[PDB]
Design a protein around this ligand. Structure first.
Ligand code: 6PU
Length: 359
């Protein structure tokens, strides 16, 4: 990769999130969103490294701090949608064409640290919160499907979560040092999702009942020894990080144990590898993968990017390269690959945005 451009947003506050729109249409330029301060901004990538500024949504509350965003599309029209959330605990669904807010969701109103859309269902939105819970929403019927919590759930802020390939299960992580698995292909959760689609408050008297899921299907505190701030599935394996200068590749159970036969009492984990790096020992730094899961990127606290090629026979064989620029010195909170991995964008604590193009 080579650095082709950079810019700084006028608010001078940390950029906490960046996401390419992997649903952008054939023959349209590549578009990414950034979140920081109380705003979300869209940019288009053009030739000669140009990053073209489009339009922002600015929250009416000056004390809102957006922490996360996620792209989906309208399941009836195919038009793109953007979900954003942060410190106020309000999920906003934004029309990215006009940047109008279309609607919003409040849970209990505590900070939301990450949003993720289900990989097969564009209406199913997962939020993770400072209140120790995850929430699954159906943004077609405007229903809260389920809350994942209880004393056997997380015991401090939830910082990240990820759906597996088919969206049959979720792995979550946070400040309690634990990683927890939640199956959403149980008969109970499949029924709840079905009921959420059948719910129309204009045609019934009942409120929609949300499931309370109080028991994860697996839990470990044996991977990391500090806050776990990012997690992603790699097939049936997990990649996760803390602030110990490492991304760990691991799985529940013993080497030969099938993920779908793991019982909630499983006490073992298997470590398949670990990707070390330097100067990323502050809390709240995310890694990202490309659409095909061929590539992994992480930025560190002094502006260096690490990129791993995962197109190798076993996880521990991943090939690392590093990307530095003499003017890029601030902490990189998140990266995003374009769908094809031709562009990598990094965003920073000084409101700076860095574009790297594949050679
Ligand atoms: C748990 N809460 C408190 C965090 C979570 N984090 C989110 C968004 C980024 C990220 C990455 C991984 C996991 C996450 F949950 C999150 C949002 C919250 C937060 C608040 C303030 C800051 N600081 C930035 C750096 N500066 S500065 C540039 O020195 O002014 C001082 C504020 C850092 C993070």
């Amino acid at each position: 990769f080579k650095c082709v451009n950079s810019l700084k947003e006028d608010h001078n506050q940390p950029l906490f999130g960046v996401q390419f729109n992997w649903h952008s249409k054939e023959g349209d330029p590549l578009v990414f969103a950034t979140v920081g301060s109380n705003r979300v901004t869209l940019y288009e990538c053009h030739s000669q490294g140009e990053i073209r500024l489009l339009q922002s949504y600015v929250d009416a509350d000056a004390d809102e701090n957006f922490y996360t965003c996620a792209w989906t599309y309208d399941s009836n029209t195919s038009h793109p949608l953007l979900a954003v959330a942060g410190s106020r605990g309000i999920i906003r669904i934004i029309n990215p064409i006009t940047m109008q807010c279309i609607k919003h969701y409040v849970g209990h109103g505590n900070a939301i640290n990450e949003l993720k859309f289900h990989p097969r269902d564009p209406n199913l939105l997962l939020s993770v919160s400072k209140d120790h819970a995850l929430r699954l929403w159906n943004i077609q019927t405007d229903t809260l499907v389920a809350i994942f919590g209880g004393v056997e759930g997380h015991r401090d802020e939830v910082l990240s979560a990820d759906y597996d390939l088919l969206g049959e299960k979720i792995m979550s992580c946070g400040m309690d040092h634990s990683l927890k698995l939640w199956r959403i292909n149980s008969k109970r959760m499949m029924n709840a999702i079905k009921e959420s689609y059948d719910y129309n408050p204009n045609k019934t008297n009942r409120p929609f009942i949300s499931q309370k899921i109080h028991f994860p299907d697996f839990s470990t505190r044996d991977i990391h020894r500090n806050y776990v701030d990012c997690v992603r599935w790699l097939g049936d394996l997990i990649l996760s990080k803390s602030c110990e200068n490492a991304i760990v590749c691991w799985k529940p159970g013993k080497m030969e144990d099938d993920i779908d036969k793991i019982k909630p009492s499983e006490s073992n984990v298997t470590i398949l590898g670990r990707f070390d790096y330097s100067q990323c020992d502050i809390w709240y730094m995310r890694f990202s993968m490309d659409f095909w899961q061929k590539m992994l990127a992480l930025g560190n606290q002094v502006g260096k990017l690490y990129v791993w090629d995962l197109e190798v026979e076993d996880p521990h064989k991943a090939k690392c390269t590093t990307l530095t620029h003499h003017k890029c010195g601030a902490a990189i909170r998140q990266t995003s690959f374009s769908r094809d991995s031709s562009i990598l964008i990094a965003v920073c604590d000084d409101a700076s945005i860095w574009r790297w193009d594949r050679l």
